[PDB]
Amino acid sequence: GSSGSSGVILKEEFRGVIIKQGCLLKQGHRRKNWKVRKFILREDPAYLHYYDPAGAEDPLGAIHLRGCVVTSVESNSNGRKSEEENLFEIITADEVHYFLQAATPKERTEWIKAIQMASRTGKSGPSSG
């Protein structure tokens, strides 16, 4: 759901289009349970913004993809319950690591490719690599 007709000025970090949208579980350092968050990906520019599902207005933050990296995790996942299933690490330009969680086993992959597609950018930008 991304559409607007004569609303408000157009930011810069959002001077692009959406490729994929959904809720993801962003981990933390403290490692105290996960927290559902609406992770929105936008290519050109290549950035990942995540807002609050409860409501909120602005994005809690953003993840630079100017030269981020995508990778899969181990995620044992075996037995029952499955504390955490379908995860993946996404390294940024700062080397920052983030472990997200996809609902379906297809989303986990899609997301990756999703981020990759954006991160892939089309060259010509702020430094880039």
Gap between the Cα atoms of 101 and 74, Å rounded: 12
First to last CA, the chain: 31
**CA-based nearest residue to 25, from 86, 78, 77, 79:** 86
CATH assignment at residue 65: 2.30.29.30
* Residue 114 dihedral angles phi and psi, to the nearest 5°: -55, -55
- Structural domain count of the chain: 1
Give the Cα separation of 68 and 95 in Å (integer).
8
Q: Which two tokens stand for residue 2?
A: 């991304």
Tokens (6 digits) for 53: 């599902």
Domain that holds residue 91: 1-129
Residues present in the chain in total = 129
Distance CA 21, CA 76 (A): 26
Question: What does each C-alpha distance from 46 to 8, 82, 118 come to in angstroms?
Answer: 22, 32, 5
Strands of 99-101's sheet in order across: 69-72, 87-91, 99-101
In the 8-state DSSP scheme, what is residue 65?
A: -
**How far is it, in rounded angstroms, from Cα 114 to Cα 111?**
5
How remote is the C-alpha of 14 from its chain's centroid? 14
Structure tokens at 25: 């579980």
